[PDB]
From a paper:
Here we show that the Gallus gallus gene we name cysteine-rich urate oxidase (CRUOX) encodes a functional protein representing a unique case of cysteine enrichment in the evolution of vertebrate orthologous genes. CRUOX retains the ability to catalyze urate oxidation to hydrogen peroxide and 5-hydroxyisourate (HIU), albeit with a 100-fold reduced efficiency. However, differently from all uricases hitherto characterized, it can also facilitate urate regeneration from HIU, a catalytic property that we propose depends on its enrichment in cysteine residues. X-ray structural analysis highlights differences in the active site compared to known orthologs and suggests a mechanism for cysteine-mediated self-aggregation under H2O2-oxidative conditions.
We crystallized GgUox in complex with its AZA inhibitor in two space groups (P212121 and C2221) and solved its structure at resolution values between 1.7 and 2.1 Å. Individual protomers are composed of a tandem of structurally similar tunneling-fold domains of mixed ɑ+β topology that form an antiparallel curved β-sheet with helices arranged on the convex side of the sheet. Dimerization engenders a basket-like structure that hosts two symmetric active sites contributed by residues from both chains. Recruitment of an additional dimer positioned upside-down on top of the first one and rotated by 90° generates the complete tetrameric assembly of D2 symmetry. Residues Y16*, P62*, D64*, F165, L176, and S229 further line the binding pocket with the aromatic side-chain of F165 engaged in π-stacking with the pyrimidine ring of the inhibitor. At different stages of the uricase reaction O2 and water must occupy the “peroxo hole” above the organic substrate in proximity to the Thr-Lys catalytic dyad (T63*-K18* in GgUox). Dioxygen interacts via H-bonds with the nearby T63* and its stabilization is likely also promoted by the conformation of the sauropsid-specific Y230 that lines the “peroxo hole” with the hydrophobic “side” of its phenolic side chain. In the X-ray structure of GgUox we observed that this residue (Y230) lines the “peroxo hole” and likely stabilizes PIU contributing to the equilibrium between this intermediate and HIU. Of the eighteen cysteine residues of GgUox, C287, positioned directly above Q231, is in closest proximity of the “peroxo hole” whilst C14* and C289 are further away at ∼8.5 Å from C287. However, in both space groups, intermolecular contacts are, at least partly, mediated by the loop containing the sauropsid-specific C98 residue, indicating that this interaction is also favored in solution.
Numbering used by the authors:
A (entry chain CCC): 4 to 301
B (entry chain DDD): 3 to 301
C (entry chain BBB): 1 to 300
D (entry chain AAA): 2 to 301
The structure:
Amino acid sequence: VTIKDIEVLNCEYGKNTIKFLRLHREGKKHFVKEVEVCTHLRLTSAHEYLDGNNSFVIPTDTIKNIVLVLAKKNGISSIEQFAIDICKHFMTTFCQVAYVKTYIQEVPWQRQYQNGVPHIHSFILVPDGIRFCEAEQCRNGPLVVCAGIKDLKLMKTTQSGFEGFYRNEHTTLPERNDRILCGEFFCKWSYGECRDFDFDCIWSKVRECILEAFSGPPDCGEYSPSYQRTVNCIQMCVLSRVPQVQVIEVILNNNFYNVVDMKALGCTNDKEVLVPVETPYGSCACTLGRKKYLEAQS
Amino acid sequence: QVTIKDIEVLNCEYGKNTIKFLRLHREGKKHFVKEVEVCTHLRLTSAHEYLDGNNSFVIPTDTIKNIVLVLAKKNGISSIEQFAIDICKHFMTTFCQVAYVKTYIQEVPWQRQYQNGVPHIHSFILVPDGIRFCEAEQCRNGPLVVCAGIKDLKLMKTTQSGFEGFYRNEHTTLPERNDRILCGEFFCKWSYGECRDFDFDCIWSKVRECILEAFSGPPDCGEYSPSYQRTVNCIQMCVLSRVPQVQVIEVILNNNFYNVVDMKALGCTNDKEVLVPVETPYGSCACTLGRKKYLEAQS
Amino acid sequence: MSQVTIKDIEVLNCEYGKNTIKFLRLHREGKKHFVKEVEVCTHLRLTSAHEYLDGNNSFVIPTDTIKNIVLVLAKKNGISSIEQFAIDICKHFMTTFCQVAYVKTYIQEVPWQRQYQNGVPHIHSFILVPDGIRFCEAEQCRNGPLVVCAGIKDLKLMKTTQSGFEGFYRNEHTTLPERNDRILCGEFFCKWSYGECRDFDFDCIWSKVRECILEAFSGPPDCGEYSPSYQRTVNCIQMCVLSRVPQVQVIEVILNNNFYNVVDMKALGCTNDKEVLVPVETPYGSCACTLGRKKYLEAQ
Amino acid sequence: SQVTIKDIEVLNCEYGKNTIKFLRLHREGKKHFVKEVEVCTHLRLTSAHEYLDGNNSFVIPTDTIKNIVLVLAKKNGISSIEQFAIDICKHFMTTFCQVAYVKTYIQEVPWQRQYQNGVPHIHSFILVPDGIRFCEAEQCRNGPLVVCAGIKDLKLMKTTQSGFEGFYRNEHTTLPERNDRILCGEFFCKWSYGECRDFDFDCIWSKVRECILEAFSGPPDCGEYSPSYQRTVNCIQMCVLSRVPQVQVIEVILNNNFYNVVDMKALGCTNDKEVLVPVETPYGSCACTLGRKKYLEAQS
Ligand SMILES: O=c1[nH]c(=O)c2nn[nH]c2[nH]1
Ligand SMILES: O=c1[nH]c(=O)c2nn[nH]c2[nH]1
Ligand SMILES: O=c1[nH]c(=O)c2nn[nH]c2[nH]1
Ligand SMILES: O=c1[nH]c(=O)c2nn[nH]c2[nH]1
Ligand SMILES: [Cl-]
Ligand SMILES: [Cl-]
Ligand SMILES: [Cl-]
Ligand SMILES: [Cl-]
Ligand SMILES: [Cl-]
Ligand SMILES: [Cl-]
Ligand SMILES: [Cl-]
Ligand SMILES: [Cl-]
Ligand SMILES: [Cl-]
Ligand SMILES: [Cl-]
Ligand SMILES: [Cl-]
Ligand SMILES: [Cl-]
């Protein structure tokens, strides 16, 4: 074996979990954006791996310094714009960069309120689904922006079943038309190259679509015949209501809530006491894209 | 070569940990959930299972789990405090070999979903903005004592915080500061003693409100904190002033310092614009205050 | 709170009916034919709303039945005047159906005129002449008065002078010049109440009110009469009707105007001395006034 | 006997400018945005000297109303027709002390941006009337500024899951009971926000439209049985009130068209609900206004 028999399929490096708070003051009123940033590069050469020559390597320490400098100089209007600014900086500054990817997630600080009055400078951590984004670009290619929400845990106590599935000698699952639907969601969507809109406004709108499609209307809900169908309802709601979304990926990790058999304990459990099964757990995942966007890619 | 005769049993305790279940209640089409994690521990009047390999008096931890689930079905859960009381009372009445029972309960923070201000009949979202818990305990022929609390409560203010005039010595490099970020993860636990005649949910919400308001100060100007320790005291004194049911209050503040990154070498000036949190190592302070009247009554 | 129920909600109004019931009533006196072609709308409010609130139709009179009743009454009673026919329809509903809380009948005439050859009326031939559509309206609530209104709409009148608009309120957004000699062109909606009085010749009084509107609009035929605004012309019409027609208790007049602009033709190398005028159809001005006799208003 | 001003009461005086049509164009670089509207603004003045005395001193010309609408569109832009109607009413109330009352009605021209291969066109539009959006704002001196929004000329049809049975029977009722007809309705829907203006007008208008379509239709896989036009109106209103707390009062008018299964027996074939002929006149109407008890009590 020698270097000549071996092909480099991929080389990538970067700085992970760069944590900082960007503070902005309008007189007495304070605004915060706390983020965690990961920035990864692929270089046009691999001399650092193949030859022990570091000449082209931008230290990961420099990646961190650049992220902090851009936050200071530019501020953070949206994590998407900040991710774009970082990718653009790397592409326009370093000719040895073949590819840049920036991942950002928001720390979910909310302003405190007292009797409906917003506090000028006090905040509470409220994780109701983590906001993230991702920007990436190859040399001479498009800068593509994705946004998402993860660690989003939703549960409805009825309007859920799973019936009429494939049966075989190892299938013991009963048909059910009235279970708890409990899901941890990862949702990620692509804007492609479109960046003419309010990133915060569209992110909020997509989140609203996910919750409403999951839940159905507040007065009656909507029957889910499978986790898979609920994923589809979420994706089709987003695509129907948010033209900026070109491609949407949803992953639902479910937890079954078992109605505990209490016969042997001398009472009847009419869907009163339910025990969650956290492992093993089921998952389903789907990615839908607009035909017109995918054809335009070719 | 040591025998039972050379050795003293100082403590023996056992139990069931992380009993997880959802209690579902339906009022027509409107669904209500209480999902909890329960730990119930017992001390028995004897230690034959340890000393002699004799299990005659041991209540299986499996039976502890069965009892918790049966009581949830039969009684429901009006509040986790009432459920913890019901579990402790059940063990003390039912089993004469129980010397002591302690029940710890924490709520899974499900919130009802709203669409355009309309509450959803049966859909919920997980929102961990401080975990509600309680603890009930009782020794044979002693009082059943109930505590409630909130933990993993993370609060931050961006100003009205300093730490000055502290003790200096040859290993003290900390500068005096009058304008830092105050970021704290709070554990708060309070005792009601034996009083259980009031709305547990209403009082818990009121104590939480006092913690947030005392931490923050008024929304138009805030309030200067001269230390983490003083902020803990302000929280405790606010709760005791506004919530007569609270006899004893413990607060633990785990802080994170946010450093203003020196950017001189990167050719720019950072005027408290970019701050980097230090998560480890981290400072902690803890205080427990009690009402003199309640502590004297204990004697 | 997840949905509203009937308990959180007030029914402010529930009304239904049949609209644009079109028919011709033909009457023959030997060879001589008489026509009355009408368009009828009849609306009911019922004493309950179970059809809306509960999906229960037990008390609902089908709108198809409303149509049948209007056609049957036209056959049985004839149409002496649209007002008497509207009265007959309201009375039928109130006396027949205990579930009717309120009835309103609106009728308009199709404006057929008999053809004339050298002043001789044709026995059976007619021409459509829409020079102001005649209508009426009768309504009654259970245990209340049956009230009759008559009117004329789509009446378009124009005079070429004796019209101005001067001395109006001026402000930074007011560019309108003062004018003392413009075209006054108005499309009129006129509606008047007789209240409960129905002892007179409906056709005769309707014709008299129409005559008053035309004469008050126009002024005397040898000189006319100066109008200082659309609003003043509306008042002159209303005060003429009230002066000459005692049966009219309350009168509503709506004037939708069209301004005729004297085209500036300077750039086209000629002078337009109020010779060529271009109507502005949108946007358009409107004014509306309702006057009532103090005696009638006090009495109710 | 000639009547004088002393015998007569002025019950109502109102005037205004109707059908003010314009397009507001906004450019963000190459990308063009349009809002084309039709505005009517009406005033009641604190005096009626223009009618009673031929004195125009207090009259704001309708031409000035038009100028103000155009000036406000230029200065403010149009984020929503509701905000524009608010801006017009506020301008009149705060500018003219002789104004007792202002009402502004606005409807949108339904321009939609063109798309090619999923790509929105920077500056090209097509007219797509799928229900006309309108709003109405009004205010009396020292009274609340009240905003209403609506959709009209909205024509919806389902081909089954509709009947009308169990209705009141009488000697003039020939309508057969039916459990499987076409339900075809032209809807006028208007709702009041009262004084609440803390929400996104465009977002809530779209949400109310969605409620109307979904309540009319039922779920797309099975639909929902309608036992009357009246019950369908109620389902629409109760869906909107359940889902849209901002709606205080909702009025729905359903004008229906019956589709008759043509009897083709004499033409030698059987028509099994294959060929249906719409009856456009006469036509049935039903109308309901529901209000929240809390809002109506707060008014008194
Ligand atoms: O909705 C469901 N989808 C599945 O794929 C599945 N497998 N077990 N239960 C299930 N429920
Ligand atoms: O508020 C503070 N208390 C302390 O005890 C401390 N120690 N370092 N910084 C500190 N700040
Ligand atoms: O007679 C008129 N009345 C009005 O109110 C008006 N407004 N513009 N022109 C007008 N002329
Ligand atoms: O649904 C209906 N409502 C009515 O009131 C009616 N009248 N005729 N047909 C009708 N259908
Ligand atoms: Cl808060
Ligand atoms: Cl929510
Ligand atoms: Cl500092
Ligand atoms: Cl005290
Ligand atoms: Cl009723
Ligand atoms: Cl003729
Ligand atoms: Cl002129
Ligand atoms: Cl004439
Ligand atoms: Cl006269
Ligand atoms: Cl006056
Ligand atoms: Cl209101
Ligand atoms: Cl209500």
